[PDB]
Design a protein around this motif. Structure first.
Motif, short mmCIF file in Angstrom:
data_model
loop_
_atom_site.label_atom_id
_atom_site.label_comp_id
_atom_site.label_asym_id
_atom_site.label_seq_id
_atom_site.Cartn_x
_atom_site.Cartn_y
_atom_site.Cartn_z
N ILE A 7 0.87 -1.15 0.00
CA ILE A 7 0.00 0.00 0.00
C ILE A 7 0.90 1.20 0.00
CG2 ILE A 7 -1.37 1.50 1.49
CD1 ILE A 7 -2.64 -1.20 2.52
N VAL A 51 3.76 -0.81 4.88
CA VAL A 51 2.38 -1.24 5.04
C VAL A 51 1.98 -2.05 3.83
CG1 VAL A 51 0.06 -0.54 5.76
CG2 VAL A 51 1.95 1.05 5.99
N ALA A 85 -4.58 -4.16 6.96
CA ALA A 85 -3.38 -3.44 6.65
C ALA A 85 -2.30 -3.92 7.61
CB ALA A 85 -3.60 -1.94 6.78
N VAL A 145 -8.83 4.42 13.26
CA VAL A 145 -8.60 3.17 12.57
C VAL A 145 -8.18 2.11 13.59
CG1 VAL A 145 -7.15 1.92 10.93
CG2 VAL A 145 -8.02 4.21 10.38
N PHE A 187 -3.97 -3.65 11.31
CA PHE A 187 -4.97 -2.57 11.41
C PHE A 187 -6.13 -2.93 10.53
CE2 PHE A 187 -1.09 -0.17 12.39
CZ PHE A 187 -1.47 0.59 13.48
N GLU A 188 -7.34 -2.44 10.84
CA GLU A 188 -8.42 -2.48 9.86
C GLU A 188 -7.97 -1.75 8.62
OE1 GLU A 188 -12.17 0.08 10.20
OE2 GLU A 188 -11.22 0.81 12.06
N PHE A 189 -8.39 -2.30 7.50
CA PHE A 189 -8.09 -1.76 6.18
C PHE A 189 -9.23 -0.84 5.64
CE2 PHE A 189 -6.12 -1.80 2.11
CZ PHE A 189 -7.18 -1.70 1.27
N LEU A 190 -8.84 0.28 5.01
CA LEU A 190 -9.73 1.23 4.35
C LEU A 190 -9.16 1.52 2.96
CD1 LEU A 190 -10.17 1.89 7.58
CD2 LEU A 190 -11.56 3.75 6.66
N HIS A 191 -10.00 1.75 1.97
CA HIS A 191 -9.49 1.70 0.60
C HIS A 191 -8.89 3.00 0.12
CE1 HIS A 191 -12.06 -1.87 0.58
NE2 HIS A 191 -11.35 -2.26 -0.47
N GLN A 192 -9.26 4.09 0.76
CA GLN A 192 -8.82 5.37 0.28
C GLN A 192 -8.28 6.21 1.42
OE1 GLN A 192 -11.52 7.06 -2.58
NE2 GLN A 192 -10.15 8.77 -3.07
N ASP A 193 -7.40 7.14 1.06
CA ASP A 193 -6.91 8.16 1.97
C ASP A 193 -7.31 9.55 1.45
OD1 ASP A 193 -4.91 9.47 0.33
OD2 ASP A 193 -3.37 8.05 0.94
N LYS A 246 -5.27 11.18 -1.45
CA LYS A 246 -5.62 10.66 -2.75
C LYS A 246 -7.00 11.22 -3.17
CE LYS A 246 -5.59 6.17 -2.97
NZ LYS A 246 -4.14 5.86 -3.09
N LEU A 264 -8.01 8.17 6.65
CA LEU A 264 -8.56 7.18 5.74
C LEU A 264 -10.08 7.25 5.64
CD1 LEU A 264 -6.39 4.12 6.83
CD2 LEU A 264 -5.76 5.99 5.31
#
Ligand SMILES: c1ccc2[nH]c(-n3ccnc3)nc2c1
Length: 273
Positions: free
Chosen positions: A9, A17, A30, A54, A70-76, A79, A124
């Motif tokens: 990532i 990460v 993550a 998070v 960590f829990e995963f999230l698709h965007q920051d 971005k 995120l």
């Protein structure tokens, strides 16, 4: 061994990460590959749960390495801002995000935990319109100056929760203007970009400033610019809030909880992005 690594990532300050899949659960996490003291501090943070933070699922010290799950999230948010650069982010969304981040910080702060290092790449977002603080508390345990509070830049060791409010004010203005507020390339250029906008601080606005470790009597003396030129065309509520978040003196700087009562959030909603 327990995780199939899907994609790099990124590469924070603290190591790599990866998006990874737990094999015993099937869950996507993550996976961050990173002292006795650091690990205790990090483990304390497993207990710090809030919907705008998070989630740190796990901490694995093994083959003398540290893995943080960590829990995963698709965007920051970084971005998201780059892809909204020509249209901007609508204000109800900016307003929703700011409100959630402030809830996030108010929780953490009430527990004497600081972030210390907020920036758009740490925020995120999901498809539900939730925004969350990532890498929270990782600074204490174990690169961009743009969000750095002036008390840190002036060499204060014993800084407070106000440093995170300063950072969030910076990110807020950037959401609105689509340009970083104080894009410094060194510590001194960072301080002087802040001074050119907000005026060189003195004993009048910031009692004690002249006795701070890296304060120099020789700093050029700039005048304060008007905030209407800094974050146009943000309305008066928004500007009133932003100026309170960017007060020089960490003690006069609005707290996260007091900011949640601000009239800017009178009409706050939760739009989907
Ligand atoms: C958890 C922790 C850090 C993370 N960084 C991301 N990320 C960065 C760019 N696109 C996605 N998702 C994360 C989830």
């Amino acid at each position: 061994e327990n995780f199939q690594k899907v994609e790099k990532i990124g590469e924070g300050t603290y190591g790599v990460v990866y998006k990874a899949r737990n094999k015993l659960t099937g869950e996507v996490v993550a996976l961050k590959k990173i002292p006795s003291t650091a690990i205790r501090e990090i483990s304390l943070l497993k207990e710090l749960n809030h919907p705008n933070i998070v989630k740190l699922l796990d901490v694995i010290h093994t083959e003398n390495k540290l893995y943080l799950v960590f829990e995963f999230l698709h965007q920051d948010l970084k971005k998201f801002m780059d892809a909204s650069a020509l249209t901007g982010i609508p204000l109800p969304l900016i307003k929703s995000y700011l409100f959630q981040l402030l809830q996030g910080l108010a929780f953490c702060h009430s527990h004497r935990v600081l972030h210390r290092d907020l920036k758009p790449q740490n925020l995120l977002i999901n498809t539900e319109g939730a925004i969350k603080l990532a890498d929270f508390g990782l600074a204490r345990a174990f690169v961009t100056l743009w969000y750095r509070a002036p008390e840190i830049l002036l060499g204060c060791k014993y800084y407070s929760t106000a440093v995170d409010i300063w950072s969030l004010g910076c990110i807020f203005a950037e959401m609105v203007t689509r340009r970083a507020l104080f894009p410094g390339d060194s510590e001194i250029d960072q301080l002087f970009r802040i001074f050119r906008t907000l005026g060189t601080p003195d004993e009048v606005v910031w009692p004690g400033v002249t006795s701070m470790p890296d304060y120099k009597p020789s700093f050029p003396k700039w005048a304060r610019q008007d905030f209407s030129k800094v974050v146009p065309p943000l309305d008066e509520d928004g500007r009133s809030l932003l100026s309170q978040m960017l007060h020089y003196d960490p003690n006069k700087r609005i707290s996260a909880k007091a900011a949640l009562a601000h009239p800017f959030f009178q009409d706050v909603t939760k739009p989907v992005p």
